[PDB]
């Protein structure tokens, strides 16, 4: 069933799973015509596929070239992304293709499971936890990857970077949705947190700085207290 | 005219047929109902007193044999039952009548309210929904459960309904996923009507003893058969004409029919919603519409 507090340990026992965020999928800008009327212009996206057992994701980019004379975007958007992630399932070997795959969004259920009517087996599944893969276009090599795409593209990122090899999948989970948290919340303190320090770099092939242990401790510190912050002063508490 | 007659009464029931129903008490000298117009299909069903639980009766069609109704002592309920004996049967029938104790069909002549709930339903697509081929006749019940429920136990018992089915392989070509879930025209034109169907009649027929069914055991399959096959014809951009005004007369003796109380349990507040003024169809039923918002506004 639905995805919650409870059966969250789930996502790390050794049945394949797949998180989708649509979120990113249909963007636009909004701007006023020379009549005065309001009007979109869209911009690339991508949709946001992720094994949070292993850290694989798969960045769908989304070129504006999809939308070319197209209708009701928004309902698109959702089909597309079902669209999608069924191909990505069908590219992937057997072995290797998974038995789960949760939606970030209830509205992406009945065109992914229309997608999916090939894999009956493959099950479909809401989540009631308030992800914030939304937050992916605030990581920068990955921001740069869409903005830059002149075609339909799929990159292959492990957004964990190297960060198993000395911490568990749960922990690895927890890391990366509290940053995506705080990028969310209020990117530029979350930005300015990560990247302070012009000693500790980002490797070419990874996304976040080279922390080490030590310096991992900090940054959530810092994280957690900026996420904090910032909900006082939403609310006024 | 026909007549089904009945052996005997020896417990206590509320006895319907078609439309009307009568309280027989236990060992009332009750013999039959008799004047039952020949032309249309009918359904003569049973309440025990004692068992408010499992309403069940027989459809039927007096043009395929001579009916009666005995008590079964052994399994406790009223069995329809065919005699093949023509004069030994049109000699019960005429002693009983003598002796008067009949109740008559009790049909208003302006009244078309039978024949507009029946006007699609043929016994011969009955009894492929009822499979039991050495009865003439078909019994249904409260409890009986459908095929489609069956998949999601016993297939003697089953309501073979035709299998609807919005998110599965026959309701979605390949490539055209988004337009055939958001447009079910291909499903229905193509895939129900043409393929399985073959006329909108065996189709409206279907749906509408899916609805009587619904509406005289409470059987909840039914039920779900029925607003399945409104929804198919609600989600489609492209339905013949004829189709779309004969289903607003169908679906309005139908609501105009239920019972008041029981709009609860067999109106499914979704479909209606969609079809009245979600779908494409929202401005096709002009009198179904009518109806429910006066009779109904609280489910809208």
Redesign the interface.
């Known amino acids: 069933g639905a995805m919650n507090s409870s059966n969250y340990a789930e996502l790390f026992n050794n049945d394949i799973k797949l998180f989708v965020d649509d979120t990113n999928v249909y963007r636009v800008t909004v701007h006023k015509t020379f009549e005065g009327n309001v009007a979109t212009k869209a911009i690339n996206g991508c949709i946001f596929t992720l094994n949070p057992k292993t850290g694989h994701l798969f960045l769908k980019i989304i070129h504006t070239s999809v939308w070319a004379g197209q209708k009701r975007l928004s309902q698109?958007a959702k089909?597309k992304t079902?669209?999608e992630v069924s191909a990505l399932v069908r590219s992937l070997p057997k072995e290797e293709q998974p038995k789960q795959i949760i939606v970030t969004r209830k509205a992406m259920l009945?065109?992914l499971?229309?997608?999916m009517?090939?894999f009956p087996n493959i099950a479909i599944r809401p989540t009631e936890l308030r992800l914030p893969f939304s937050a992916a276009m605030s990581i920068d090599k990955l921001s740069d990857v869409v903005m830059k795409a002149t075609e339909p593209q799929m990159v292959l990122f492990n957004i964990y970077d190297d960060w198993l090899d000395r911490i568990s999948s749960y922990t690895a989970f927890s890391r990366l949705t509290l940053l995506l948290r705080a990028l969310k919340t209020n990117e530029e303190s979350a930005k300015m947190i990560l990247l302070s320090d012009p000693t500790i770099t980002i490797k070419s092939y990874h996304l976040w700085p080279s922390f080490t242990d030590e310096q991992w401790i900090t940054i959530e510190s810092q994280m957690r207290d900026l996420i904090l912050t910032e909900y006082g002063r939403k609310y006024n508490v | 005219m026909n007549t089904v007659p009945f052996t005997s009464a020896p417990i206590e029931v509320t006895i319907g047929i078609d439309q009307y129903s009568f309280n027989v008490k236990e060992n009332q000298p009750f013999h039959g109902i008799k004047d039952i117009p020949i032309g249309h299909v009918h359904v003569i069903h049973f309440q025990h007193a004692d068992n408010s639980s499992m309403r069940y009766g027989y459809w039927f069609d007096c043009r395929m044999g001579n009916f009666y109704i005995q008590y079964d002592p052994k399994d406790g309920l009223y069995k329809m039952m065919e005699e093949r004996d023509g004069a030994k049967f049109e000699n019960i029938v005429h002693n009983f009548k003598e002796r008067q104790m009949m109740v008559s069909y009790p049909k208003i002549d302006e009244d078309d309210t039978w024949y507009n709930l029946t006007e699609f339903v043929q016994m011969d697509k009955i009894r492929k929904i009822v499979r039991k081929d050495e009865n003439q006749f078909s019994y249904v019940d409260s409890s009986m459960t459908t095929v489609q429920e069956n998949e999601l136990s016993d297939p003697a018992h089953s309501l073979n309904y035709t299998v609807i089915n919005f998110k599965s392989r026959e309701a979605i070509r390949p490539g055209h996923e988004m337009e055939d879930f958001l447009d079910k025209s291909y499903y229905l034109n193509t895939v129900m009507l043409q393929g399985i169907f073959k006329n909108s009649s065996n189709y409206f027929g279907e749906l509408q003893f899916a609805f009587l069914n619904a509406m005289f055991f409470g059987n909840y399959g039914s039920s779900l058969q029925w607003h399945a096959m409104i929804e198919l014809i609600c989600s489609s951009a492209t339905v013949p004409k004829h189709m779309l005004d004969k289903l607003d007369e169908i679906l309005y003796y139908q609501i105009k029919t239920l019972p008041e109380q029981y709009s609860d349990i067999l109106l499914n507040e979704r479909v209606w919603n969609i079809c009245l003024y979600s779908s494409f169809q929202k401005n096709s039923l002009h009198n179904t519409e009518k109806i429910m918002e006066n009779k109904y506004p609280e489910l809208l």
Request: no cysteine; proline share 9%.
């Open positions: 698109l089909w079902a669209e009945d065109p499971e229309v997608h009517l090939d």
